[PDB]
Ligand binder design. Structure first.
Ligand SMILES: CCCCCCCCCCCC(=O)SCCNC(=O)CCNC(=O)[C@H](O)C(C)(C)COP(=O)(O)OP(=O)(O)OC[C@H]1O[C@@H](n2cnc3c(N)ncnc32)[C@H](O)[C@@H]1OP(=O)(O)O
Ligand SMILES: CCCCCCCCCCCC(=O)SCCNC(=O)CCNC(=O)[C@H](O)C(C)(C)COP(=O)(O)OP(=O)(O)OC[C@H]1O[C@@H](n2cnc3c(N)ncnc32)[C@H](O)[C@@H]1OP(=O)(O)O
Lengths: 183, 183
């Protein structure tokens, strides 16, 4: 019943936004007793916390699937980035949830990026130690790479459904290699 | 001047209480102007978000140009401008809530802000590419990569903490930029 509440919430919030979606809509669409909502969630905004945790987990597994079978950390970045943009395109209906989280639950919005950065920092520190990538604060470098991904996702996937041309995809690979390769 | 009092009052109130809780009565009282005047300048409350975002865009871009006008090397414009952005973002930090709620309440002006910035950015970058200063790639895509970095770094190092970047991190960021952009 918890899971049904969660799945119903995701579809409704993505559709109508947060403020328009009542607990009633959610429990109605989920097909559970209205009372159970309040047991699992003191306030309506507490639902966002578990939603963003699931998205964070799914996005990371998705990307990990494509990055764990790869050689160069520089390949990891190039492929990882490409795959994030594909992922964002598959999940573009849901981006409204993330926008709403930044308004109504800023702590979980921060959590999402900080959790992603924590995972990313480890991987980049290992490549630094091999001499594979530029030796710099690896948290800082994670935010640089995440910031790039987020903004391209907005411009080329959310605000346009063009995606990137082949020429832009080659330019972006060149940007990333040039940034990361020790001179 | 009435218009300027209304705008200043709105900025302060929206930053403090959010957009939904700020009434036109609050705005015009804080402003010290006749209530009905608001409706002469703005059809709706939402229309004053558009004007606020325009003013912040102009003023951010004026501030940065001020530091970057004096530098011939585009590589230096990018290092310095990034630093100056973090300083501006620190100074205007309490206002960032306005931008967050603009994404929900006026998404066309939120997008406009980034598109306008990239428009100005794109011109400066293709100039540098011509002279062989920087890597020859799609200059709008490059804009969005650099804007993306700037935005995520402001979030992590200015809005989510008030620590800022260390001196070492600042040099690391300089290197990241120089590495990305130099063929
Ligand atoms: C609101 C919408 C809009 C949301 C829109 C959000 C906008 C995001 C903007 C930023 C975009 C990016 O930067 S995306 C990054 C693009 N670049 C890259 O991907 C290149 C770098 N890649 C990497 O370093 C890595 O691929 C990662 C770090 C990103 C993720 O690796 P990771 O996090 O270490 O992966 P890992 O722990 O191994 O496993 C991931 C999660 O999967 C689960 N998991 C583990 N095993 C299994 C299993 N058998 N079945 C199911 N699930 C499993 C775990 O519970 C774990 O979460 P848990 O329970 O352990 O916590
Ligand atoms: C909501 C809260 C938070 C909002 C939070 C916002 C989040 C931002 C996240 C990303 C931030 C970034 O990437 S900041 C990017 C950081 N990087 C850099 O700065 C490096 C590269 N820098 C540059 O290339 C340039 O410095 C710029 C592009 C960023 C800006 O140059 P520009 O856009 O050409 O500036 P320019 O048009 O010449 O002047 C800007 C405005 O000044 C006005 N202006 C005013 N007074 C004067 C005057 N006396 N003389 C001339 N012009 C004047 C003009 O009308 C013009 O507006 P008008 O004619 O257009 O009306």
């Amino acid at each position: 019943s918890l899971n049904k509440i969660l799945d119903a919430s995701v579809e409704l919030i993505a559709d109508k936004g947060f403020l328009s979606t009542s607990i009633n809509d959610i429990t109605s669409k989920a097909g559970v007793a209205y009372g159970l909502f309040y047991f699992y969630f003191k306030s309506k905004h507490d639902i966002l916390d578990e939603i963003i945790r699931q998205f964070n987990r799914n996005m990371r597994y998705y990307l990990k699937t494509y990055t764990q079978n790869l050689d160069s950390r520089i390949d990891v970045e190039k492929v990882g980035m490409k795959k994030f943009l594909e992922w964002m395109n598959e999940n573009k209906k849901y981006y409204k949830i993330f926008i709403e989280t930044q308004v109504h639950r800023p702590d979980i919005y921060k959590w999402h990026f900080m959790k992603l950065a924590e995972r990313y920092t480890t991987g980049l520190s290992e490549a630094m130690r091999r001499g594979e990538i530029i030796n710099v604060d690896p948290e800082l470098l994670s935010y640089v790479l995440i910031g790039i991904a987020h903004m391209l996702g907005k411009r080329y996937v959310l605000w346009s459904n063009s995606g990137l041309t082949l020429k832009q995809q080659r330019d972006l690979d060149l940007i990333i290699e040039n940034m990361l390769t020790p001179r």
